[PDB]
């Protein structure tokens, strides 16, 4: 579908082909995060630290509960109906997340039956198991620091020093928490927040949180790094200071008739100057339809591209024509830097700009020369079994394309400038030229 | 409102032991620091000891440390003090008080007796 | 160990008076000062804590300050009901407890 | 001023209206940060750690003092005058910051009268109060770790182990500090650095630093997250290794006749394809004047937009005409992804592309159909009291606009492509067309 | 080469001139990082923590070794030759890095002769010195925490608590490690990863790592902050769980006939409105050739610009003409915000828009007035020895340019709009105008 | 496969000391926890003690703590138990076992005797 | 201290039976349960650990569960080879060791 | 420049106690480690003890630990050593020295006697 | 405990000589070596520390090295003023102090 032979002559060498995968079909599991430690074993050295901490934390947590109440108070069974008049203004994603919240409320009630047990936990990780329905894990922030450092040093340091250490630890925890759970969290009714961000309520240790789930999959790291494991806040307690979070754990599904092709850029020679083609380096093909892709939001692995949603974007007709063989429509830009690549290897064949770099044939010792009418040279073992470029010596294979590659020639597109200020300059100059042409007709 | 009441013997014979009890109403003794103070007739205040019953912690005035023992009773919400080998210098008015301490909002450390009992007079004759 | 107060102070009505309290680096230099009032034949009450913070239901005519190893209590708009004894106290790091001043009796003319 | 009814027909649904707030009128307060801990209680276990640490820290701190001296040595009382010849080259902001720096030196001298007391602090947070004018807080880095962890374990571990632990802690502190206080700080004469960044000198615990100030305000979190609380370095001591920082604490003032309007984008149907309008989603209206806003630098809350400066930017005449009702000038882009939103809710009324998603009337059970001539459908309770879209059931209100909304029709603007490479492709193609038209006249 | 006098009249005031420096000629040194701590002094309280940790870490480390094996198995001496057929597809940088890896394997073998000694280290930093060739430093993650916190508290806390603390510490370490060493690292055969990123395997303490090298240079901080100190993974052990890293330590070389000029933007007056010129603020001049520079990737100091590679980019002919004195080709944009700078100081001379700001002469007390035909005013001591602008008082020098600066006048370029949506709007409008002009010819 | 063998005296006179030895094949005693259990004829199991030879750690049943001593020998890979002042209540079958304990992958804490020896009968007469 | 088990249990073949084990907050409430089997005249073996995890080579007819301070062992498809004694054990935080139940003898009809 | 001077008795009777004093000029004894060394006539050096006066820390040679006491005097900037129950084996030349120890810039740990005194001869007859 | 040195060494003038010092894992294997010189009838002085670092005002003809549990001191350009005794010392982790060698006497021909 792409014309690789013509593309290689303007410095776009064929790269690795990859699969396309997207997340789907999540499983759900609920967990409790308690945001205040249990200080019952150091109660004589607490002062008024916990009161001030509770005041600050309540100030942080009140708006989140307020935002959840908007959907909680306006949703009822019919199979669930929302009161659109009361909600007023909302995106589709927010409404869907509200439906999910209403679904989670039942297990939330079951968990909240364990309030007294939740308040009395004294270890960093605890599994509460009373009945088959009343079972949940509890993770407590800063409990490990209190149990390991402060309690063992009682009476080895003064009570004043212990109190100051506890206060400083709590203040640092709040300083770290504010970025994720502060006013930046305008929309808690959603399921797009990653588990890594949520784990800041537990000091950023998401490995332990995921271990409590008990799942097992070969795509675990790929799911994590593609930002595909998310969580949603379902309940906030303003008297015990804990939250309930529902975690969504999906699978990765491969799009059947789709692939993503990479292109490696190489500089080429034209009119005693060095140039590079301005063409996207990643192209998505789905059912023989060509498009761009916003690959900066995806995860690129050796064999596939993994994304949490479909990031396809449209492409102009001229660019699509350029990719299919019409090289006079592919733009180019001048090279004024020494860092631009000058050669590449594809399927055992070398594509090199031997005007800009020295190319030698190790088998015979003779130099490899490029004429002024050639953009770049294809080197395989029909002409040179082993090539030398600087300090690099490479043994080569055989080219599967045309046997007359180096004698054909190609048509060259127009130059462009991609700097941001240069874009405005070019737009203004084109508009002025258009105005001149328009006023020439009137006179 | 938190209230405190002292109780003890009106007269203590010399070389015997003085026992005092503080009874608290409106709060649990196991969630606060408490303290004992005394004032001789016509003179200034003197600190005796501070206690945290929940963990059994105690801080003593170094001059009186060797003659002071403390005890508690959570069921009746009471705490008791005992001073042994009393002489004529130990006649005074005795008070129990609630004694919070710690850092303020702006990290200034302080101690204060914020609630006082009426006090009980002890005469050594 | 102990804080130094003046035994007596006196000032006429509608005037203002100041009572000083002197200590050391272990108690006043590093920690705050509390002020207590004792009226004739009644329970002692807390007037000031953390060097300047008034307790609930305490008149604004009472103020406190601290400088170096010394502290001061200022009373303005002096009235007859202000006749009492006044005591200063401070936490001492070497004792893990409070140390008291000698007390100052206030007489209004 | 905006034509909401016409805009909704090209998928721009009216969203929340917000107020505009900007920081102003700051209060000032000075504080000392000591960057070397007091090791007098473990002096037998120090080796040569402190000497090496001091060498490294002096290397870091010398350029900052050098930069401050340029303004300190060239400013005198007149009401203050700067020597422009000696300064040479400066922006207006730098000169204003220099004036502020000269203002702070009077309190800097009083603070520096406490040098011996500052050097002898042995706790993480200390308040020095000698006189009414000589009063300041001192915050000491790493003192808590030394007091809580290293001193209590003396003789439980070897002296060599204690020394190594101290060295590693200091090295980690420097590694974290270099990002903020290293060569990236070439302009310390300014008041634009946030308090969060400055707190890196105290391990990143800005909560404690702000608590020492003793302020109280309901807009505290909004001030923090809008990057409106800043600080300036006023004095550097190269022998005791501490700095003096002046913190600026402003209020938030609301601009009276201004507001910010949000638009929610929804795909619409035209010519058997799906489209999305390319229009800014946040519009600033001030005194009935329309402009863009660089909202990425501001904080968006439920009720207002909060910024540390005025971020208004100009808008083209064609775009302003598009916003006021001339929909033939609003550009559009093709949709080739399944993630684009398909419906939205505004003031209890549904705007939905029912060609792309299934729409049903719960009240009657009959389907809701959209013709090819309609871009999207408005659904209220005059025709559908309760609507079903997938798993979403919504009860609706009444539309306050025209009663003939679904039968009027609108005019559609031209398609565009927004990809970065496609921009250069389009510019080059337009220039080639212009050249062809120009050369047609000559012949 | 630049026309500074004409540029200053459109608000582009001459700023500081800086040197151009690029890294070159690196020295190499190898170091070992062990990623599992030695728990032999607490072996009774380990449970099954180490087995689970090893499973997770092996899962992380296997792909890196797999990627290295591709080059290791296909490179042999000839002076080294790569098997191009076996490699298949590769960029030039990857092949060069493979050559470097083959060179490093020789010292890797000598280091691996010390496997038993490496496994038995029990301190955070250890220097192994067996022979002149068998000498290397070993850095062990989390060993300091175990030695300082967990071992001293044995039997002060329960064995269960100690085990839980160890597990949590290991989990936090993995949570931090995954960002750098996870699936995001698909190309370990390279030498572009910074030493700061590599130090995450040692808790992010790159200061200690660099201290073990023993180097000394005055450009140390500049080398660090310009991302010029890099490292490469040479060997991975999947049974002892350590890696060998080669560090590259370069020098900075100054490009001889090159410099970088900065321009300070100031608003100016035209037609009862305020404008700002749209021109790049940093310009690179090399051998009297003018170009742009992608300065966002470089480090800007007081005296020089420091980069890890050449970041020069081309510039349009019209912009180059604008910079050389053709001011009618310099675009401009309207000002609608109060934050834009209104004056600047260059070589002791003031350039100010005194229509927008109040300008007074302190020497005489009379106001300084600007007419409607003047873009801005140059103020030196020929007309005002001391100037007052708001709360700023400045003593001024003498202007070295034309004595008739304020009475000449300049030609003004065309207006432009730089907002991203406005770019597409302008492109579409220009295309529509071009289509209208084209169809006028046919009819 | 790890295997264990108990050894001891068939008959122990009253008030004397009982000595038992466990020999391990297939593993080193210095890398695991071990434990001792006994069962009286016709009754249930009773825990005696757990040991970690590498660090010399020991946990005791509080009822039998005062009469129990332990020892080891790494060269022959054996560990030994001694119970003093035996009465008629100490006749039983005795077992040694491997006794791992810790948190699981999902942070559930557990203890288990995963390998048992055949056991040896001791009669006190 | 000790765990409570029923002394006996009985059920016919091809049926299912359940054995209970009761404890307290220090042992079963906070920690998991292990189950051991003792056949007539042979070595004891570990059946269940961590409240539900079967050992290697243990038939799927054995299952375990825990709720509150109690635990249960369920045996389905009852056969004659299942006649034995069954013991439960749990780690106790106050002892730093296991506590055993009294044992239950299973008789099949 | 730091300088050190030793002082002591020329002759010590057997079974008595030998006392030595080191006086420092140019530095404070409370900011450094110090050490004592001795050399028998015609033989090699032998380490005695190291001291940190500011915290009163001391490290001993295990052979001589039971016979060594140390003391200090900050006003006169002196530190003193005392060896009890001396025999004929204790006749030697004695030195005091400054003894810094720690990690270098490249994390190599070392110890060194960087400044030595002239020494004093002690004969036990 | 103790470090092993050769009792004597000898070499002619203008030549070079090497002195060895042998130890164990607790002192030389894990820590560095210091070298001291004792001239006839004069105060001892520090020559080398940290295995290779010369003291101030020490000639470049002295060098040091360490390998395994052994260390060496090399003297080049041998002269008559170099006749002395030489001692090696190393910190020992089991003693929290230095251990000395027996010393080597250097005679020039
Ligand atoms: C300009 O308009 C023509 C006519 O519709 C169209 O074919 C062409 O793609 C447009 N180009 C751009 C850059 O808008």
Numbering used by the authors:
A (entry chain C), D (entry chain A), E (entry chain B): 27 to 104, 112 to 476
B (entry chain G), F (entry chain I), H (entry chain H): 1 to 125
C (entry chain E), G (entry chain F), I (entry chain D): 2 to 110
Publication excerpt:
HNV invasion relies on a series of spatiotemporal sequences involving the attachment glycoprotein (G) and fusion glycoprotein (F), including G binding to ephrin‐B2/B3 receptors, G–F interactions, and virus‐host membrane fusion triggered by F conformational changes. Compared to the asymmetrical and flexible G‐tetramer, the F‐trimer shares a more conserved sequence and compact structure among species of the genus, facilitating antibody recognition of each monomer and increasing the likelihood of cross‐reactivity. We determined the cryo‐electron microscopy (cryo‐EM) structures of the NiV F in complex with the two most potent cross‐neutralizing antibodies (cnAbs), 1D6 and 5C8, revealing the pushpin‐shaped paratope structures and hollow‐filling binding modes. In summary, we propose that the tight dual‐protomer recognition and hollow filling mode of 1D6 and 5C8 enhances the rigidity of the F‐trimer, making it more conducive to locking F into its prefusion structure and less sensitive to viral variations.
Three 1D6 Fabs bound to the F‐trimer apex at a 45° angle, with each Fab rotated by ≈50° relative to the F trimer's 3‐fold symmetry axis. A single 1D6 Fab covered an area of 850.3 Å2 on the F surface via interactions involving CDRH1–3 and CDRL1–2, with two adjacent protomers nearly equally sharing the antibody footprint. At the contact interface with a threshold of 3.5 Å, a limited number of residues—12 from the antibody and 11 from the antigen—formed a robust interaction network comprising up to 11 hydrogen bonds (H‐bonds). Although five of the six CDRs participated in the interaction with F, CDRH3 was likely critical for binding. The tyrosine‐rich “YSYSY” motif within the central CDRH3 loop demonstrated high shape complementarity with a pocket formed by two neighboring F protomers. All five CDRH3 paratope residues were positioned within this binding pocket, engaging in extensive interactions with surrounding residues and contributing 7 of the 11 total H‐bonds identified in the interface. Each residue of the “YSYSY” motif participated in hydrogen bonding, with two tyrosine residues forming more than one H‐bond: the mainchain O atom of Y100ACDRH3 interacted with the Nε (donor‐acceptor distance = 3.0 Å) and Nη2 (3.1 Å) atoms of R244F via two H‐bonds; the Oη atom of the deepest immersed Y100CCDRH3 formed two H‐bonds with the Oγ1 atom of T241F (3.1 Å) and Oδ1 atom of D200F (2.4 Å). Twenty‐three interfacial water molecules were identified at the Ab‐Ag interface. These interfacial waters strengthened the binding by mediating polar interactions via hydrogen‐bonded water bridges or occupying hydrophobic cavities to stabilize the interfacial architecture. The 1D6 Fab was sandwiched between mAb66 and 12B2 at a lower position relative to the apex, making its binding less susceptible to the Asn67‐linked glycan.
